[PDB]
Design a protein around this ligand. Structure first.
Ligand code: HEM
Ligand SMILES: Cn1ncc(NC(=O)c2nc(-c3c(F)cccc3F)sc2N)c1N1CC[C@@H](N)[C@H](F)CC1
Length: 464
């Protein structure tokens, strides 16, 4: 038959906003244990459908994805990339698909293809060596360092080369104001931002929204700066990065602006996400050092100690694909996808969802469903390993964090390689640790990309 999505009772004026609280991915998980995979809330006057459960989500984003491929018109998204973002604008028709395919292409052309030896491979090692040299310096003087300030540059340098052909040192000024001065949570985009549903909070004293409205103007400046320095030195046959790749196309509807700001779409996604991933990894390595050995033990068995890991080795290091798989899962640092929206009156598991309905996708619920994982709160990479030491290719596919369907991540490949290549080169020549007896807050901080309370105590050691 056909029924309306269930849900709990919400306040008439504000809705369930007082129930979501500060960690919606948790609040909405406990709901899904009561109302299931399809449930309905209201934030202010706007109703929202929260999709949970692995198979329920697969049914909507992939099989019926053409019905769920849209984005709601939220206030915060109008501020990103001049309200014309490929990823966040309400545009989802042909105009958008054209921009995605140009994005996937510019990546495959300056990320995967060979360098006249892989593009991504050459860069990651480039900044990995630098990163190591740079961390040694802090062990010399201060003795202790915060791993984030330096990982973010080293990560940013990579995505920044694939896009603008430039690299910046770890103590630059313009870049730390760009990708690090923010040193905040990233929450005004995290699904459930009250300003998107309570119109008044946009005009009231809101510094988080002022630090955010400003950080975007700064980002959109760095784009124009590079687009011009690239058009000042542009050769119609010699393409040097995704930036050049886009310019070349503006010559061949699609405003010149909706094509160029795409390189910003890759750049803002790149540095933010992969950085967090590597940061969390260090936090785990430092917290549970058995995994620090069992991941080194593999690294000294497959390849040696007089060999820098190449990108061809990710296949034959299963314990590391496990650690990656677990760090993605246990943290689930992308707990919600970017909110979706129904493109037409559709149905899911017997429920009616009308056209235009804001929908949340609770990736955090899948990665911590006790129905699937035995002990979801424990960090145990060993849960992905078959009795013969290999990766269980059906459970690794149940770790959801890049999305599904027509809107999934276009840099999943590049994120998985980059996160494995960065980790390999370090730990082979490095023993991260933290002195016993200090506070390390492993608690996550809600946001689009969840972060952690920065830690200034890490100590890198050179191996035997
Ligand atoms: C661990 C790292 C990463 C994670 C967890 C991640 C996750 C995601 C998620 C959950 C979405 C949206 C899902 C949805 O809309 O339903 C997304 C979209 C996107 N991602 Fe990533 N991503 C990562 C790295 C990257 C990288 C390295 C790039 C590019 C260099 C990238 C580029 C994009 C873009 C352009 C979109 C927009 C999707 C669209 O507009 O259709 N991501 N990513
Ligand atoms: C392409 N692109 N250009 C600009 C962005 N935005 C930011 O980096 C960003 N800064 C944020 C922030 C902050 F730094 C400090 C204080 C408060 C804040 F709110 S919140 C957010 N989203 C993006 N993406 C985001 C990452 C990825 N996961 C997406 F899926 C796709 C693209």
């Amino acid at each position: 038959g056909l029924k309306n999505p269930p849900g709990p009772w919400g306040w008439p004026l504000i809705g369930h906003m007082l129930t979501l609280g500060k960690n919606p991915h948790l609040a909405l998980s406990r709901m899904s244990q009561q109302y299931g995979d399809v449930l309905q809330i209201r934030i202010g006057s706007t109703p929202v459908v929260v999709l949970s459960g692995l198979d329920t989500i697969r049914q909507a984003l992939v099989r019926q994805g053409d019905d769920f491929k849209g984005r709601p018109d939220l206030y915060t998204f109008t501020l990103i990339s001049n309200g014309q973002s490929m990823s966040f604008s309400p545009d989802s028709g042909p105009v958008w698909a054209a921009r995605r395919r140009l994005a996937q292409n510019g990546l495959k052309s300056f990320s995967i293809a060979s360098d006249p030896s892989c593009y991504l491979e050459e860069h990651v090692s480039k900044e990995a060596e630098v990163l190591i040299s740079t961390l040694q310096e802090l062990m010399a003087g201060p003795g202790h360092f915060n791993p984030y300030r330096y990982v973010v540059v080293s990560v940013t340098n990579v995505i920044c080369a694939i896009c603008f052909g430039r690299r910046y040192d770890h103590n630059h000024q313009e870049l730390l104001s760009l990708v690090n001065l923010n040193n905040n949570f990233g929450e005004v985009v995290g699904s459930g931002n009250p300003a998107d549903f309570i119109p008044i909070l946009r005009y009231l004293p809101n510094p988080s929204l002022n630090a955010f409205k400003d950080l975007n103007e700064k980002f959109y400046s760095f784009m124009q700066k590079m687009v011009k320095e690239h058009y000042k030195t542009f050769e119609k046959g010699h393409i040097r990065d995704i930036t050049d790749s886009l310019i070349e196309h503006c010559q061949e509807q699609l405003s010149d602006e909706k094509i160029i700001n795409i390189v910003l779409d890759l750049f803002g996604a790149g540095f933010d996400t992969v950085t967090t991933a590597i940061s969390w990894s260090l936090m785990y390595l430092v917290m549970n050092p058995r995994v620090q050995r069992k991941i080194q033990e593999e690294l000294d068995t497959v390849i040696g100690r007089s060999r820098r890991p190449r990108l061809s080795d990710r296949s034959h290091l299963p314990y590391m694909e496990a650690f990656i798989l677990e760090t993605f899962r246990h943290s689930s640092f992308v707990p919600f996808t970017i909110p979706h929206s129904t493109t037409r009156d559709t149905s899911l598991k017997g429920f009616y969802i009308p056209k235009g309905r804001c929908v949340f996708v609770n990736q955090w619920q899948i990665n911590h469903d006790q129905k699937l994982w035995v002990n979801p709160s424990e960090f145990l990479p060993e849960r992905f390993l078959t009795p013969d030491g290999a990766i269980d290719k059906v459970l690794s596919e149940k770790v959801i964090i890049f999305g599904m369907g027509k809107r999934k991540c276009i840099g999943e490949t590049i994120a998985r390689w980059e996160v494995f290549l960065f980790l390999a080169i370090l730990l082979q020549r490095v023993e991260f640790s933290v002195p016993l007896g200090v506070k390390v807050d492993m608690t996550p901080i809600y946001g689009l990309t969840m972060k952690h309370a920065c830690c200034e105590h890490f100590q890198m050691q050179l191996r035997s």
